[PDB]
Design a protein around this ligand. Sequence first.
Ligand SMILES: OC[C@H]1O[C@H](O[C@H]2[C@H](O)[C@@H](O)[C@@H](O[C@H]3[C@H](O)[C@@H](O)[C@@H](O[C@H]4[C@H](O)[C@@H](O)[C@@H](O[C@H]5[C@H](O)[C@@H](O)[C@@H](O)O[C@@H]5CO)O[C@@H]4CO)O[C@@H]3CO)O[C@@H]2CO)[C@H](O)[C@@H](O)[C@@H]1O
Ligand SMILES: OC[C@H]1O[C@H](O[C@H]2[C@H](O)[C@@H](O)[C@@H](O[C@H]3[C@H](O)[C@@H](O)[C@@H](O[C@H]4[C@H](O)[C@@H](O)[C@@H](O[C@H]5[C@H](O)[C@@H](O)[C@@H](O)O[C@@H]5CO)O[C@@H]4CO)O[C@@H]3CO)O[C@@H]2CO)[C@H](O)[C@@H](O)[C@@H]1O
Ligand SMILES: OC[C@H]1O[C@H](O[C@H]2[C@H](O)[C@@H](O)[C@@H](O[C@H]3[C@H](O)[C@@H](O)[C@@H](O)O[C@@H]3CO)O[C@@H]2CO)[C@H](O)[C@@H](O)[C@@H]1O
Ligand SMILES: OC[C@H]1O[C@H](O[C@H]2[C@H](O)[C@@H](O)[C@@H](O)O[C@@H]2CO)[C@H](O)[C@@H](O)[C@@H]1O
Ligand SMILES: OC[C@H]1O[C@H](O)[C@H](O)[C@@H](O)[C@@H]1O
Ligand SMILES: OC[C@H]1O[C@H](O)[C@H](O)[C@@H](O)[C@@H]1O
Ligand SMILES: OC[C@H]1O[C@H](O)[C@H](O)[C@@H](O)[C@@H]1O
Length: 600
Amino acid sequence: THLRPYETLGAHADTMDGVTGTRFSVWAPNARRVSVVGQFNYWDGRRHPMRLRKESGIWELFIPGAHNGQLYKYEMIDANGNLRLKSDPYAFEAQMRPETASLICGLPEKVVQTEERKKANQFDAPISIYEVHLGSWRRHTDNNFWLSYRELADQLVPYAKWMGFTHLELLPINEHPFDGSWGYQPTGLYAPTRRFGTRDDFRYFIDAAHAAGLNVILDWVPGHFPTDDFALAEFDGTNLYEHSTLIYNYGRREVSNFLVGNALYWIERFGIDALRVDAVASMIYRDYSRKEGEWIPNEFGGRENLEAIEFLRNTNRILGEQVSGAVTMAEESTDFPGVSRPQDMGGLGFWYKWNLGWMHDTLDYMKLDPVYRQYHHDKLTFGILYNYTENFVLPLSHDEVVHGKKSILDRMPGDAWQKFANLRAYYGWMWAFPGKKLLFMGNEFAQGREWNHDASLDWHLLEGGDNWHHGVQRLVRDLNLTYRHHKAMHELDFDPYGFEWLVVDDKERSVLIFVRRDKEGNEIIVASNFTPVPRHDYRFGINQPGKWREILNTDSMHYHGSNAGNGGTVHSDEIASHGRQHSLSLTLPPLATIWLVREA
Ligand SMILES: OC[C@H]1O[C@H](O[C@H]2[C@H](O)[C@@H](O)[C@@H](O[C@H]3[C@H](O)[C@@H](O)[C@@H](O[C@H]4[C@H](O)[C@@H](O)[C@@H](O[C@H]5[C@H](O)[C@@H](O)[C@@H](O)O[C@@H]5CO)O[C@@H]4CO)O[C@@H]3CO)O[C@@H]2CO)[C@H](O)[C@@H](O)[C@@H]1O
Ligand SMILES: OC[C@H]1O[C@H](O[C@H]2[C@H](O)[C@@H](O)[C@@H](O[C@H]3[C@H](O)[C@@H](O)[C@@H](O[C@H]4[C@H](O)[C@@H](O)[C@@H](O[C@H]5[C@H](O)[C@@H](O)[C@@H](O)O[C@@H]5CO)O[C@@H]4CO)O[C@@H]3CO)O[C@@H]2CO)[C@H](O)[C@@H](O)[C@@H]1O
Ligand SMILES: OC[C@H]1O[C@H](O[C@H]2[C@H](O)[C@@H](O)[C@@H](O[C@H]3[C@H](O)[C@@H](O)[C@@H](O)O[C@@H]3CO)O[C@@H]2CO)[C@H](O)[C@@H](O)[C@@H]1O
Ligand SMILES: OC[C@H]1O[C@H](O[C@H]2[C@H](O)[C@@H](O)[C@@H](O)O[C@@H]2CO)[C@H](O)[C@@H](O)[C@@H]1O
Ligand SMILES: OC[C@H]1O[C@H](O)[C@H](O)[C@@H](O)[C@@H]1O
Ligand SMILES: OC[C@H]1O[C@H](O)[C@H](O)[C@@H](O)[C@@H]1O
Ligand SMILES: OC[C@H]1O[C@H](O)[C@H](O)[C@@H](O)[C@@H]1O
């Protein structure tokens, strides 16, 4: 019953005696005095000094005629007799950057999650995420002004839906004061940033996404305490939200009530269908060793923060009980055990983990010159080995395209034509490899310079006639749309059944072949030739003979590939290859991957 602090704390419309006003409550149990100051009383806190309930530590007071729209603050004298104003930790709407004051409105209406959105999160579901930072995806050209939440509905959602993505993941939209944090250093946890409009424009924007068939993942930030002025730091003159840099005292009921509630709020009150936490490693460790001693099983040097580890665990359980169908995802880098394993098994309790190791391993490989990929087969092949230890998302995130890491396009080897060929052949490996898929805005049309959180994306790359960039984009649209159609590509991602090697070592040629199969037993053959060399009459074993039809060739004219493929429907011919009792002779185009389906 303390899992929706937001439903009662903060500032909410109420009616007393039949006189409309607004009701104010703030948790500040070591204050000597609290007052609401606002427009309604000309920022004079003498007028409306609040009332303390010693039992709970909450200050209360109802102001008549105070209506939503009007800015306010809490002016307290803290526990030590100092004087400061505080912004509402439960501000649902806030002034913009330097202004930093809370606007009064209430909760939006609860949003009920459809059976359709709930199926889209499930492990058997095709899950292709399109990751976006709203502040830098497009801009108005003349102004270089931000697209509003409302303009983002007009543009982003038709564009995400068009491209065939399944989900839409936004970098944090909690209110924060500086752009370059990207939103991962917040101030107002319950307020969507005013950059792009009002709280209800945000609503209108996710409602619009919903209506177009997209789920919305939201980067959630319980890991980074709010360091700035008016934040929570030393909230009532004591260390209230924080511990004696700065970490939340998660062990304290009201703080967990604050943060677990934040999750329910975003899910229940805006209809967000999934939350992700960046940098769990930061949250669950700390720089210094415990110093009480060594009561440490899973040796981590005793810098583990158990208090925080219980928090993630407890949050996942509550989110399971209370809002089933919404899910949570994590990115953790210390190889911590079982971030995506059930809490009961002792895991963190997250549903999917970002597969940072597979992204590191593949890009390195793809980085290399095609003439050396013979000596590094392991980076493609060892991926499957660890796959069944987590429920993985193949990332290609915003973090991999910034700060001196070249764009994903810049890492490819070739002379121009080569250079795009890798990408087209890469993506079609990625989409065929076990795991859900996440891709960051810009990668889809093979942008060339790094992402600039301070600028629109180089959309101009797609002005002009069909070119290399139109080809990466169109391929991706096909990868998705074919990915979504074939149960094989997504049903058994986490079952050893769903994947089987057909050619783990043909190392010299750098050729790799495997299949993905669903629960019925239908298979899809995928073939990648990671060397610029074309390959004809290539032969290898199959489990199922019959008619095989090329459903996607990475190399085709539309993607500005060679356009040279196998031709038409291929029929299996009995020859002995790899002891499978059936073999195929195929064209392995140059720097391209191939996908085959078997015609009945
Ligand atoms: O050499 C001269 C000059 O060059 C440089 O200035 C360039 C900027 O540095 C550079 O950023 C680029 O600015 C880009 C911008 O970064 C990028 O986001 C992109 O803008 C897109 C919009 O996002 C997109 O919407 C579309 O705009 C639409 C709009 O959505 C729609 O509502 C309607 O208004 O139609 C618009 C199109 O007309 O497309 C644009 C671009 O295609 O592109 C920007 C480029 O304009 O380019 C600047 C020009 O050089 C150097 O920085 C400077 O030192 C040099 O003096
Ligand atoms: O231009 C826009 C285009 O959009 C739509 O076409 C898309 C298709 O709907 C979609 O299936 C996909 O087409 C793929 C195709 O699936 C894939 O097999 C591959 O086609 C290869 C052949 O496999 C290969 O044999 C070779 O064709 C040879 C042929 O064998 C030979 O007998 C002789 O005819 O020479 C041919 C040379 O082309 O190469 C082709 C490559 O085209 O790649 C296709 C393109 O990706 O994607 C299509 C484009 O998005 C609409 O259906 C269509 O009306 C529109 O024109
Ligand atoms: O429309 C009048 C005025 O609006 C804006 O100024 C207001 C601020 O936006 C608002 O935050 C508030 O400022 C208070 C601070 O938050 C608080 O820390 C302390 O300094 O008390 C202030 C109020 O005295 O109120 C002001 C206006 O009173 C806008 O920025 C102005 O351009 C505009 O003139
Ligand atoms: O033609 C390139 C074009 O593709 C997409 O435009 C879509 C549009 O989003 C849909 O609403 C519908 O009209 O189909 C169009 C393509 O046929 C992209 O949205 C757009 O950026 C791009 O220029
Ligand atoms: O000056 C560079 C940038 O610094 C910070 O990101 C500020 O929030 C932003 O307003 C400014 O443009
Ligand atoms: O720096 C950006 C450039 O990187 C590489 O040169 C790409 O080939 C080119 O397309 C892109 O414009
Ligand atoms: O498949 C033919 C290809 O051979 C090589 O990759 C060339 O670099 C490229 O220009 C050509 O298109």
